[PDB]
Structure formats: C-alpha cells, structure tokens
Design an enzyme around this catalytic site. Structure first.
Site, PDB file in Angstrom:
ATOM      1  N   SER A  98     147.818-121.030 -36.560  1.00  0.00           N
ATOM      2  CA  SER A  98     148.148-122.587 -36.286  1.00  0.00           C
ATOM      3  C   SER A  98     149.267-122.616 -35.434  1.00  0.00           C
ATOM      4  O   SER A  98     149.439-123.613 -35.003  1.00  0.00           O
ATOM      5  CB  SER A  98     148.489-123.324 -37.650  1.00  0.00           C
ATOM      6  OG  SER A  98     149.627-122.691 -38.206  1.00  0.00           O
ATOM      7  N   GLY A  99     150.027-121.460 -35.028  1.00  0.00           N
ATOM      8  CA  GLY A  99     151.053-121.559 -34.271  1.00  0.00           C
ATOM      9  C   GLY A  99     152.352-122.006 -34.870  1.00  0.00           C
ATOM     10  O   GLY A  99     153.474-122.233 -34.402  1.00  0.00           O
ATOM     11  N   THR A 100     152.414-122.008 -36.189  1.00  0.00           N
ATOM     12  CA  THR A 100     153.496-122.443 -36.985  1.00  0.00           C
ATOM     13  C   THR A 100     154.609-121.845 -36.713  1.00  0.00           C
ATOM     14  O   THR A 100     155.708-122.172 -36.860  1.00  0.00           O
ATOM     15  CB  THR A 100     153.246-122.379 -38.599  1.00  0.00           C
ATOM     16  OG1 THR A 100     152.162-123.258 -38.966  1.00  0.00           O
ATOM     17  CG2 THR A 100     154.567-122.595 -39.568  1.00  0.00           C
ATOM     18  N   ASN A 121     164.149-128.674 -39.838  1.00  0.00           N
ATOM     19  CA  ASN A 121     162.929-129.358 -40.226  1.00  0.00           C
ATOM     20  C   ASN A 121     163.051-130.962 -40.026  1.00  0.00           C
ATOM     21  O   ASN A 121     162.329-131.546 -39.403  1.00  0.00           O
ATOM     22  CB  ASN A 121     162.621-128.868 -41.880  1.00  0.00           C
ATOM     23  CG  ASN A 121     161.123-128.910 -41.824  1.00  0.00           C
ATOM     24  OD1 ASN A 121     160.275-129.842 -42.515  1.00  0.00           O
ATOM     25  ND2 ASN A 121     160.571-127.872 -41.460  1.00  0.00           N
ATOM     26  N   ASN A 122     164.297-131.382 -40.661  1.00  0.00           N
ATOM     27  CA  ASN A 122     164.194-132.956 -40.723  1.00  0.00           C
ATOM     28  C   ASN A 122     164.613-133.641 -39.220  1.00  0.00           C
ATOM     29  O   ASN A 122     164.233-134.685 -39.081  1.00  0.00           O
ATOM     30  CB  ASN A 122     165.239-133.426 -41.562  1.00  0.00           C
ATOM     31  CG  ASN A 122     164.946-132.963 -43.020  1.00  0.00           C
ATOM     32  OD1 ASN A 122     164.046-132.423 -43.392  1.00  0.00           O
ATOM     33  ND2 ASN A 122     165.908-133.029 -44.202  1.00  0.00           N
ATOM     34  N   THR A 177     119.637-111.069   3.617  1.00  0.00           N
ATOM     35  CA  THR A 177     119.162-111.301   2.158  1.00  0.00           C
ATOM     36  C   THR A 177     118.561-109.981   1.610  1.00  0.00           C
ATOM     37  O   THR A 177     118.041-109.080   2.480  1.00  0.00           O
ATOM     38  CB  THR A 177     118.090-112.422   2.476  1.00  0.00           C
ATOM     39  OG1 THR A 177     117.013-111.643   3.223  1.00  0.00           O
ATOM     40  CG2 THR A 177     118.733-113.634   3.290  1.00  0.00           C
ATOM     41  N   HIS A 178     118.447-109.886   0.273  1.00  0.00           N
ATOM     42  CA  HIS A 178     117.833-108.835  -0.425  1.00  0.00           C
ATOM     43  C   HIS A 178     118.485-107.405   0.386  1.00  0.00           C
ATOM     44  O   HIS A 178     118.127-106.272   0.291  1.00  0.00           O
ATOM     45  CB  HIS A 178     116.475-108.600   0.012  1.00  0.00           C
ATOM     46  CG  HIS A 178     115.725-109.837  -0.526  1.00  0.00           C
ATOM     47  ND1 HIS A 178     115.100-109.847  -2.040  1.00  0.00           N
ATOM     48  CD2 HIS A 178     115.687-111.075  -0.028  1.00  0.00           C
ATOM     49  CE1 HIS A 178     114.385-110.952  -1.856  1.00  0.00           C
ATOM     50  NE2 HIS A 178     114.560-111.726  -1.109  1.00  0.00           N
ATOM     51  N   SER A 308     147.727 -92.004   6.176  1.00  0.00           N
ATOM     52  CA  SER A 308     147.826 -90.558   6.628  1.00  0.00           C
ATOM     53  C   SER A 308     147.279 -90.395   8.325  1.00  0.00           C
ATOM     54  O   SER A 308     146.085 -91.033   8.283  1.00  0.00           O
ATOM     55  CB  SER A 308     147.324 -89.560   5.850  1.00  0.00           C
ATOM     56  OG  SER A 308     147.227 -88.308   6.082  1.00  0.00           O
ATOM     57  N   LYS A 314     141.355 -95.559   8.767  1.00  0.00           N
ATOM     58  CA  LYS A 314     140.885 -95.711   7.465  1.00  0.00           C
ATOM     59  C   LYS A 314     141.910 -96.773   6.666  1.00  0.00           C
ATOM     60  O   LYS A 314     143.114 -96.448   6.403  1.00  0.00           O
ATOM     61  CB  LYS A 314     140.956 -94.623   6.826  1.00  0.00           C
ATOM     62  CG  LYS A 314     140.329 -94.714   5.277  1.00  0.00           C
ATOM     63  CD  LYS A 314     140.104 -93.251   4.384  1.00  0.00           C
ATOM     64  CE  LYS A 314     139.702 -93.646   3.041  1.00  0.00           C
ATOM     65  NZ  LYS A 314     139.115 -92.158   2.400  1.00  0.00           N
ATOM     66  N   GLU A 321     140.440-105.015  -4.413  1.00  0.00           N
ATOM     67  CA  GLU A 321     140.016-104.344  -5.555  1.00  0.00           C
ATOM     68  C   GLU A 321     140.914-104.856  -6.914  1.00  0.00           C
ATOM     69  O   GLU A 321     140.263-105.263  -7.750  1.00  0.00           O
ATOM     70  CB  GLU A 321     140.443-102.670  -5.300  1.00  0.00           C
ATOM     71  CG  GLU A 321     139.662-102.137  -4.154  1.00  0.00           C
ATOM     72  CD  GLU A 321     139.944-100.830  -3.887  1.00  0.00           C
ATOM     73  OE1 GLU A 321     140.779-100.361  -4.351  1.00  0.00           O
ATOM     74  OE2 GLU A 321     139.335-100.299  -2.931  1.00  0.00           O
TER      75      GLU A 321
END
Lengths: 450, 450, 450, 450
Positions: A98-100, A121-122, A177-178, A308, A314, A321
C-alpha cells in the site's frame, strides 16, 4: 552514533544524522529486498513533498492545524520536493503493498525537519490515509516525469528526425518489403515514417496524462469519505494543481481509484506502444547504416566510439544497441505492470509500489535513451549518396517506367535478360532491340514515381 | 582533481582517485541511461575478476604472458572478485549490447591496479574478445548467485515450511475448491503442498545450472577459434571451475553460444515457474490468516509491525505483500528476457547486458524475499485451533460419513434440513428421526477421511 | 469432382463446388498451420466484401472499370459481407505475413461469383495492393466488432451491474483491505466500483476506435501513391464510411500505416486494461458468494448448473470461472500482439494476420463472456442480508463510533476485552463500566459512517 | 429431430443423432464463448478415451464393475481415442475451470455408445473426480503430441538443416556482428548454429516429458485418497502407460498436482525457448536470401509461389513469414499460460482448460510450421557462390592475414587506402609499395582462418 527513539513496539536505535523515525528504521531492516538499486524511485519522494506541503495548506484552511506548525511542515515538505532531503528515504520498493512505509517515511522526516525549523501522524498525515495518499503521489510524479521530462525530449527527437527528413528529401532510394527489392521512395519519406511514429507516440503518452489527472486523495482507507472534512478532495486536488503547474481533478469514484490502478496499466500501454515504434526506427537505421563493404551502407552513422586504425570506416551503432535494449526492458516492465494490475483485492490493490516503480523506471529510461540517441546518433547521420545511386541503377524494379512507352513483353524481356546476365536495365535494353541511351533517360527518371 | 589519460580519440580527464581509463570514462558519459540504479549488477563485476584472473593463469600457461605481469594482474583481478574495487565500475546496463564497455572497464581497472602492485588490451584481454568473454561472465555469476545464494535460502524456506507441516499434522480442516466448502484434509497436508512446490522449484533452478555450465570463452569474435591458442577453451573453462568451486564445461558449439542466450531464457523460465509457486503459497497464507472477525482466521500471522492499541489483533500480512510484489516483478522480468532472447542477429546477440541484469535482479530479489518471508512470517505462524474446529462442525460436508450407515435419503434429509435452518448436522439428525448424540460421534470422526 | 484451372505455376485441381481459384487452392495446401481452428477470422472475410464492393464503386467513379463488371462484383462482394459465401475462405492465419493470400482469396471468389451473376487481378484488385488493402480490412472489421458487438454488450453489463448497485444500496457491509477487517461501506458502493470500472472500460475501447478510423487504402505497395488515381484514398475511405455506417478517414502518413500496426497494439492495450477490470470484479463476486458454511457467503449466486441433492446450497461460480479464463487469454493475446507489433521491417510489417486475429479473437471472447456473465450471473445475484448483518455486529471496527462520546481509552478497553473474550462490542461495553444497551444504539449506527 | 432426456434440472431436448446427454447439452448452451474455433482441442478428447478405457480395466480389476459393462465402455472409450466420435464433443475451452463439463461430455457419450454396443456417473466416472481426472488427460495428450508429433518433425528439421550444413561446408562467407562486416566463417558453420539450436530445442522439450510423466489420477476432489481404492493410482497410471506406449508415474504429492499446473508452465517455457531459436534461424535465412539486386542474396530460396513474368527472380520467403508468425503466437500463448499458472486457489486451480489449450495449440502450430518450413524451404535452399565470393573479396576484413608477414603499419595503409578509394585489398597493396599478385594469394587464403 545513534539516537534512541519510540513508536509502540518500543525502543530502537535511529542513526544520529538521519531525519527519519522509528517506523522507518524498523521497516528498513525488515524489507531490504534488492538492495540500494530498488531504493524507492526519487521522483516519488519529491511528490510526497508536494502532497504533504499541500496537505498542510488545505488542512490549515479547514482550520484543523495551528499556523505555526503549518509554516514549519511546509518548508520541510518543499525541501523534499526540492531534493535536499533525498538521503533520508532509504526504503525499497518491495515493502508494504500500500506504500504505507514510504508515506510514514515522508511523515517522519518532514516532521523532524519541521521541529528543527511536530507530530508524524496527527500533523503531517492529518486528514489522510496511507491508502488514498499513495496512489496520489503516483499520479503526480508520473505526470511530472512525462510533462517535464519525457514529452520535451520526445519532441526534440521528432524535430531532429524531421530535419534529416527535410535534408534527405531529394535522395531517391529503393524500398524493401519482405526484405526484398521494391519500387522507389525518397530517403526523406522513409524518415518521415519515423517522424510520424514519434509524433503519434507523443500524443499517446500526452493523452495518458488524462487518466492520471484524477487523484484519489480524499478517499482515505476505503474510498469512503470518513476522517476527512467535506471538500478536502476538491481543495487539496486544487491546491496540488497550483503547486505542480499541472491541472489535476479528484477521482469521481474513490473506490475504483484505490481498488485498482488501471490508469497506470493504460499509460504503461502507451509507453509500451512508443517502445515498439522506437525499436523499429533504431533497427532500420543500424541496418541501413551497416557495412562498409558487406551491408547496406545507405546511411553513415557517427563514430562516437574510438576506432582501431587497422579497421577504418568501422562504426558500431552503439546508440542503437542501447536504445533497443531499453525498449525491450519497457516491454517487460509493462508485462510486470499488467499482472499486478489485475491483482487488486476488494477495497485495495496492494501492488502499488511495484507498479509505479516500473512505470517511473520506464519513463526515466526512455527519456535518457531518447536524448542519448538524438544527440549521439540522429543529430549527425549523413547519407552515402554514391552507394544509394549505385544500388538504384542495379535494381530491376525501375522497369515499370518503360511499360507504357514500350509494352509489357519488351519490358519483361529487358528485366528477364538483365537478371540472367547480372547486367543493368540500361545495358540490357541496349544490347537488345529496345531503345537508346539518350532516350532511356527520357523515360526512366527515378523522381517520376511519386 | 583529475588525471589526463589517452586512448585513440585523444585526451580525456579521468578522476584522480579512480582506477579506470579513458574508454570507461568516455562510455560513462555516453550511456548514463537510468542513473545509478541501473549500475551494472555487482555479481557480474566480481565474475570479471574470476575470468581475468583465470585469463592470466591460462595465458601464462600457454606462454603468452610474462610471469611478473601475471602475478600482478592476478592479485588485482582477485581483488575485484573480492569486492574491494567495486566503486570503479560506474557503467550502466544500457551500454553496448555486447557488454564491451564493462569488459573494457574490468581491463582498465585490473590494469591500473596491476601497475600499482600493464596493458589493458594486450595483457588482461589477451586471447579473448568482448564477445566470447561477456556471455562467460554471465554464466559464472548466475551460477554463483544460484548455487551460493538462492538454492541455500530456498532449502531453508522448504525446511521451515515442512516443520510447520509436521506441527499442524494433527489439525483437521475444510478443503476449498472453487473457493467453496469441500471434504476435509489436515492443515499439515495443505502445507505439504506448499513444501512440494518449493522442493520442485529447487530442482527446477538447480537443473538450470546445467545449460549455464557451458561457457563461450574460446570462441572470440564469431565463435571461430581465431586469435586463440588451441585448447584455451578447455584450459580456461577448467581453470575457472577450480576458481569457482563449480564444474563448468566449454560450449560444444561456440556459435550458438554467442548468437543466442537460450540458457538464460530457460533458467529464467525456471525462476518464473518458481515465482508462480510462491505467489500461490503467499496468497493462501494471507487469506487463511485474515480477520479477526470477518475473514478465515485459520492461521495466526506474526505481528512484525507495530500495532495501534485501538485496533487489537489486527495484523497485515506484510511479508506476503512484499513477496507477491517480488513474484510479479519476476514475471515481468522474464517477459523482458524472452523478447531480447529472440532478438539475436546473425553471429551475435547484442541484448546481453539487459538479459543477464534482469536474471541477476530476479535471483537477488527472490533470495531476499524468500529469506524475509521465512524469518518474518513462516517461522512464527501458529494455528487457531478453536476457529478451525468451529468452522468444521458448522459445515455440511461431513455428511458422507453417515451415508453407508444410514442411507443417502436420510443423510440428505439431514443436510437439506440443517441448511434451511442454519443448524449443524448433529442438531439436525437429532431433531429428526435419524440417530443419537453418543452414536453420531461413533460414525462421524473427522480423522476417518484419509 | 474438381475443376481444372490456371494461374502461372500451371494446372491445378480446384473443387467443383467452391468459388475460389488456383492461387487460393495452392496456398491452402502450403499453409495448413493449425487446422480449421486457425481458419481466417470470419469478421475479416466480411470486411473484404465491404472493401471490394467499395473498391468497385470508387474505381468505376474514376472511370477505370466497365459498369457491367462493377454491378457484378458489387453484388458478389456484398454477398461476402452478407455471410453467404463464408465456406469459400478456407485460408488459415499463418499464411503470408502481408495477408496476400486471403486478399487473393477474396478476389478469386468475388470474381467467380461476378461471372456467374471477371478478372481477379485487373478488376477486383484494381487500384490496390495486398499491402494497403489488408491493414484496411483489419481496421474496418475491428471497428465493426467493437461498435456493433462489444460496446453494446459492455453497456448492458454496466446497466445490470448498476441495477444491483441501486438494489443493494441500503445494505451496509464490512470493507476488506489487505484482506483484513476494515470500516463499513454499502454493498451498493462496492458494486458501484465495479460499475465505474466497466464504464471506464467502455470509454477506453470506444476511444481506440479513433486510431482505427485511419485507413491505409491508397498507399499501395509502399505507402507511395503509385498505381492509384489521385484522391482514391479520400473517395474509397469515404465510400467505406457510407457502407459501414461508421466514419473513417484515410491515413495521414501511408508509410507509418503499412510499416507498423501501432493502432492494434493500442486498442489491444485498451482491451487488456478492460480484462484486468473484469478479472477483479469476477474474483470478488465468487469470493463474496463462497460458502455456504466455510466462506464469506455475502452474496448468493444463481444455480445455472444442476445440483446433487446430497449437497444442497452448493453452487460453483461457473460464470466466474469462464470469465476469468477468458480474461487471462486476452492478457496472453495482447502479449503476442506487442512483440509482433515491434517486428515491422522497413516499408512493411509482415505480422498482420497474427495481429488482427488475436485482436478479433479477444473481442469475440470478451463479448461472449460479458454476455454470458451478465445473464447467467449478475442478472440474478441476491444479497444474504442475515449473513451480512451477522458479520457486522461481530466485527470490532465499529468501535470508532464511541470514540468521540466516550474517549480513546474506554473504546479500546471495549475492543481489547471483546477480542480476548471473542465477544461483541455491545456485550463488552455492558459487562464493563462503559454504557447501556438503549444508548449503545444511540451512538453506534452503521449508516452513520458515510 | 431431438430426444428428450433427464439429469436433475429436468427435461431437455438433446439432438437425435448425437451421443451426449443432458449435462453436455445444458452446458453447451451456457458457454458458447468463442464459437467453434475454441471447440475443446481434439487431442484432449482422444485422451479421455484412453483414460476412460483405462478407468474401466482398473476398476474392473478392483472388482468395482461388472465385466459386461466394462467390455462395453472399453470399446466405446477406445473409439473416442480412435477419433470416430469426435463430432460428439461440442464443448468450448471457456467452460468450468476444472474441465468438469468436458469430462461429463466424455462420460455421457462413452455411456450412450456403451449401451448401443450404462451409467454416466457410477460406471464411466467410477473411482474418479472431475478434479484429478482432467489434469491427467492434459498430461497424456501433451505427452502424446510431443513424443508422436513434435519431436519427430523436429528431428527431420534438424537433419534437413544438417544436410545443407554439410552441403555448404566448403563455402567461405563473411561474418556479421552488430550487423557489420567481421572475420570469415563457412556458411556451413553458420548453419551448424541453426542445427545446434534445433538440437538443444529437442532435448528441452523432450526433458519436459518428465514433469508430465506424473499423473494426478487417484487424488480425486482434493488430492486426498477418498472415494478411491488403495493402489488405484499406481494401477491406473500403470494401465495408462501400457495403453499409450509411454511411461507414466503417479504424482508423488496429489495436492500439488491439482492446486497448480507448474508442469505446463515449465513445458511451455521450453516450447517458448524453442520458438526463440526458430525465430532467429527464420529471420536470418530471409535476410541472407533477400534481393536480387538490393539485398544480401547469399542464399537462394525456393519459389513455391507463382511469380509474375515482369518481376523475374523475385521470391518472397513466405515459409519464413509463416514460421515467424507462429513463433510469436507461442510467445503470447506462453504469457497467457504463466498468469493462469499463478492463479491457483487453495486446493484447486480452475484455469485448466485455458492452460492445456494454449499448450496444445502451441504444439500443433509448431509441428505444422516446422514441417511446412522444412519441405517448402530448407529442403531446397541453394547457395549463390558467385555473390558470396563477390562480397569476400570486396571486404577489408581479410587484412589480418598480411599482418604477420608485412606488419601492422603496412596492412593498415592497405586497408586505409582501399577504404578511401573504394578499391579491394589486392588492388590497394599493388598500387602501393606492399607486395605482388602471385604472392598476395600465397598469404591471403580465405580457408586459412579456422
């Protein structure tokens, strides 16, 4: 050094320099799942500040809190939203569903800072539960990561793509295509498909902001108004809108808002659609740019990596990637999000932390890779015009240009012969009884095929 | 303070106190995807030490390296495996899809430490590529996280479950098919189903160790032996076995080993099967233990969390919530792993980093939650015998006990009447012309139904 | 009996009674993947009629076809859309990834029927490719299955749910967070959460109609206008709108429309979100209705199945089981849809058949189960008021009612004592020095908690 | 024409010519989800025969049934296993999650046939439940589809692939990492990677047969032995082994066997791994074979489809497209299988039908496509030696051959120059002061690189 503190389960040693209390310290030692890598997503920590700061203003309005206390909580709360007290949120994702624990983490530290400038709390958690409050912090952060981070960098990605689209608009290339040879199109038109996908992607995630605009705050423990002053929802959801710069409404049905997080499953589904779009663009570019001698080599990708000398020309499409690796992660993250999304039980869905984490993780990753890819790749791509032209004239697809001004039989004989010989359509037409060189061009102009 | 260094793309400022070189520094600023949370999984960093240390021994054997250099790289390499130089691996997961950047990260630091005690490429990366080397570090780490971390904690989980199975073996309870009331079984038998699932889970992940036992090292850039001495694979994969304490063979087909990571998809599929098993057990226990007045309340879960005096006897199954959140994450992680697992291209699959990360992340999470759940939940569960007995006698399912010694008509009249009145089978049989109190027990003994 | 026919690859025996040609017969014997179960989804067959009929009208307009031929193709085409020539489409889903085979199937039969009332390629497939044409048939059918089938039955599901919501609006019940006892809410409010989820689901799928409104037709082989008259897109997409009763535009970027089917991934993601919503509602109801003696038994489910006399009052939520089985199938189908959705290659995505099939299969299944569930379950659910009241008074959660008119100490003593004794709050307050019977009610009224 | 019959819910019109009873007729009209396409997978229908036939033999052994009745049920049961009474199983997958409806379908028809040659519940379903019985029919059929259908056709696929591997073993080609030009390897070695993947795939699915070898039969309604004679499990699971030709044991823990179907999630995960392997092989081949002028065109794919004369040499890899479409479907089907696989509830998992269907559907599809692909593609692939050689000499990667007998500086000058000029390494070395033609070959032999 430590600092003894109390809660209910008794005494506990809390580090001297940290702003949290007992509850955070006890939970921190009970759910150490995944280590620091799973540490609750920061943009979620910041949203708690916005919410707690707003919780102060709206509860002070309803006269529920002393102004002195408020001015204190507010400053402390906004310092969380600021990012100064980030090292005081050591909680992981796999905690209470609940992420309490993180909500109590926010309260304990925003309380101990308030003092320094009182009740966890209060005061800080006044008029709110760990149930209505968390799915409100999810929507705020998510909305902020998209409007402020994602969308912006997504537009740049589209503009950078559209510049090149304009830039290569004159370059005619072969369609595939293909994976096979097809009729021509400009390389700019190819890139305008990438641009359109990105554009659609933006509207898709921008649209998701709508389901996220509805906030649970005000529904407390079960979606029922109990322990809240009337209109707190409308005031708080209004106060938060002024605090974020974004428009947020309160959820029409507070039950649906706690029992299920369909708005996350939707949004994720939109990010998921975007990931598909970016995978295709990134794979194309790396194939289009592969080589130098045994690949398409239609495009020339930037060499952001040191090469290199023994291997000149290259260049590994490393920004492609990294981007495709990101995209898959999102597909997986979305998967994780849908199961959790169906696992709600009665009045509350206790799979919140894991859902908003994967959602926040997806957004961060996308923005980072979208940026990295733009700057380190697309913003420097250049066409290899000589290669492209080399491959245009070698293809037999531009044979339909002759068809009207020659006839299907002659045009196929040209194609049939050129294929068997491994010769071009021009050469074939010439050695055969068909047409002339200074006439072949009169009819076979690449840019005469829309 | 910095320290200028060289690579090829020129000059670059490398932090003064860090052990890495230029390449790591340049890549670190090119792929900052996800921030520190995505920082390359530590157990992968440690495996590089084992591999580089082993790379030294085996290359020194083949006479390729000077002993002085070796003794230096070895110590530096084993200090990585040790975990002392962890802060020198700042690289994220979304980098080059071949893991080249982290491999070069290992080399740069194991090189600069070697000096201190020389060449990043010629010495540390001697007789190896970034291609055969990475999928070897994946298998080693994964194998180590399972054999040393997972399996061990998985067995404890089974023993702790089996203790309670033995402990509640005398307690007869009602079965729940289609969530409806069914015939009886001991609560111990219920828990022996959980135990069997866990046991099967162990054999499933233990079996996966087999596909991971095959190492790529020796296949270099394409799976072809080039740039490697004959038998390097067998020696290195042997040297690594002696270094890890685990048995590793070399991959029979080096191509299949680089072009695809099916061994990760399998193993993940086994962890994925385990996650399903643990979700069911964790959900049962939380339902079985729900209450106190409006739920099953068959089991009594430990109260590891501090409770409010106003709400006594209320305990949220927080170790169940954290466990189920983990389990889903794995389902998602596996999803991400299978797509990436089909995306290999020709001679190399460039989706390595993202695959082994999710795999390592799944293993860490499982072990942590398996531990947390055992200690903070199962190791303290106790039966609510009075509730269980209360619910046994209230059910009409024990009506088939009378059947042989009464007849189908009478037994159904008992059931038909008791249902309409909302009375027990005993009370019904008595008010009707059926049998006696001191005879009803003579025939309806719970523990007479296997 | 057969009927010899020709294509190019020569002679082939085509069944005497079937309306298809050679190409369909040759492909039928080449891709028999999956058998009749995978036979191309009917609503896709019908869409071809709408498209081919429309292809006639619009091409006759552009003067490309002889009116006699048109009137013939039109009638034959509309008889497909009608559903009379369904047994002439024997092709499976796993055929050519562009849907070429089914498009040629439509042409061959709409051609042989046209005769009977001429050319498969020049007439029926005039001004269109197998590439722009298929993703147009996908959008049309999908749009029709949603607007005409799904949405309608989805609304009924919401109304039937809202009736009961109104019907149980007076019944106060206990809330269950973390599966534990919580503060009260009406059973009608519980069901209004189900109603809201369904409502949101409708807007989610209704919204998806938008991305599907854009049609590819007019983009031919690569998204380029070639082999099409100018404005054919606008005319055909207009002609189709008048033929279907739905508004359809033509795709702004014809490339994005062929290279990827993001509009299917989106829509599927919306159906996927709906499936999550329906899983939660269906599981709740079966848990809420479980029993009779050892379960919640809050609701009473219809007994559409024949029950054994020996087991009275036992009813398996079979409409819940069938619904949840459906929902999961969709989650899986969506998974299959997203991978295929990222696998587009350059100018064309050859994963069309498999994408639109799973999408059509999801829609059919949802509608069927949504109907079946409404009529055979929700339309007959009734509350077990005595059980609900029994469980309200047994809970200790209504202790906060006393708090303001008693004090936290006294109220907890009541709760603390009642828990230890296994007695109700009323009984506890009385045996202790707290309040009176004819006063306890004065303050603890269930319907005084919003 | 019909035939009135009885059950409990009264009178009902059962078709005159069908062998089923009331229960099947009532359920058939209650769960029409998906239409005939979702009609319960045939190989599951056949398994019921094997089980019911075996149920007869083993119960007659235990003396529970009259021999006359047995000889009748046996023949009728084996006629189901035979495939003659297939049209009497009209039930869909989305029925009761325990498979109760199809089990009762088997009983009703095997009962009405037995007569013809008596009791649906007391005779055919003697000593068995709808709970232990169904997950036994799942394992039997699955095992039979794999051992008899899949594995066989999977081996042929491997042999056909290995033949070509042998056939192209002399052909040297360029490797492609990151889609870029790399060092050489034989095309046979490339195909030996495909072969190894297929081989591993076989062992992976063959291994899955093991978890499926364990049968639930004997565990009845909850895994408890009740309503069964001692040793029925061992006898029946033994009788079934003799009936199928395969070895089957009984499940060691009958609870784990009903509450969860982890053995399906595992097996599916193995089929899922196989699908990844086949996607990569199928995509490679289509890329490798693309062209003719603007693609790799390394391989020449069969032209099983009729080609247009105007486009000679064009062949779409349609067996690749169909195969990849299949593969994705499996990825999706597995997804659907894992969620359902985690959704077990207490003593019974009511997601059986949907799980075994997707599993059976995956196996059928794989076998069909594996066959179709072998025969219509791989069994006719031939190398384009002239293209391959053309591309070998054009690449600069064979520059490392000179390195030892020339020096890094000279070899890079060759590569650096040849790249800038767009000339080959031979031509470059010659125009520069490096080596001779009749010496270049002396050192640069392709087949001297392992």
């Amino acid at each position: 050094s430590f600092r003894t503190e109390t809660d209910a389960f008794g005494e506990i040693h809390v580090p001297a320099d940290k702003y949290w209390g007992a509850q955070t310290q006890r939970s921190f030692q009970n759910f150490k799942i995944g280590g620091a890598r799973e540490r609750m997503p920061l943009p979620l920590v910041h949203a708690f500040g916005v919410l707690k700061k707003s919780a102060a203003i709206v509860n002070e309005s309803l006269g529920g809190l002393d102004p002195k206390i408020s001015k204190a909580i507010q400053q402390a709360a906004d310092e969380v939203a600021s990012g100064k007290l980030d090292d005081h949120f050591p909680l992981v994702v796999f905690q209470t569903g609940s992420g309490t624990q993180s909500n109590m983490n926010a309260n304990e530290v925003i309380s101990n800072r308030a003092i320094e400038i009182v009740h966890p709390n209060n005061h800080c958690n006044q008029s709110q539960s760990s149930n209505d409050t968390f799915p409100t912090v999810m929507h705020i952060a998510a909305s902020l990561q998209i409007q402020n981070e994602l969308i912006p960098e997504l537009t740049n990605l589209k503009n950078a793509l559209e510049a090149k689209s304009k830039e290569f608009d004159h370059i005619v290339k072969i369609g595939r295509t293909h994976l096979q040879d097809a009729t021509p199109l400009t390389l700019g038109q190819e890139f305008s498909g990438y641009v359109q996908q990105v554009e659609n992607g933006i509207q898709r995630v921008a649209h998701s902001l709508k389901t996220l605009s509805f906030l649970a705050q005000g529904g407390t423990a079960v979606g029922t108004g109990l322990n809240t002053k009337p209109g707190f929802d409308v005031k708080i959801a209004e106060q938060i809108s002024k605090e974020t710069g974004l428009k947020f409404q309160t959820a029409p049905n507070r039950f649906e808002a706690l029992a299920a997080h369909d708005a996350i499953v939707e949004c994720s589904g939109a990010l998921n659609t975007l990931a598909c779009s970016l995978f295709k663009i990134a794979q194309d570019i790396r194939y289009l740019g592969s080589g130098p001698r045994c690949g398409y080599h239609e495009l020339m990708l930037p060499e952001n990596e040191p090469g290199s000398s023994i291997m000149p020309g290259k260049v590994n499409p490393t920004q492609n990637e990294a981007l495709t690796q990101v995209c898959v992660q999102v597909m997986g993250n979305n998967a994780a999000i849908t199961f959790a999304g169906s696992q709600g039980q009665f009045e509350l869905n206790v799979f919140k932390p894991v859902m908003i984490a994967n959602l926040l993780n997806s957004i961060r990753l996308i923005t980072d890779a979208a940026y990295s890819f733009r700057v380190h790749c697309v913003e420097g791509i250049k066409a290899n015009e000589p290669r492209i032209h080399e491959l245009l004239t070698k293809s037999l697809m531009l044979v339909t240009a002759l068809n009207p001004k020659i006839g299907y039989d002659a045009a196929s004989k040209v194609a049939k012969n050129a294929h068997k010989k491994g010769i071009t359509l021009k050469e074939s037409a010439l050695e055969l009884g068909v047409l002339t060189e200074k006439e072949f061009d009169e009819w076979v102009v690449p840019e005469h095929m829309l």
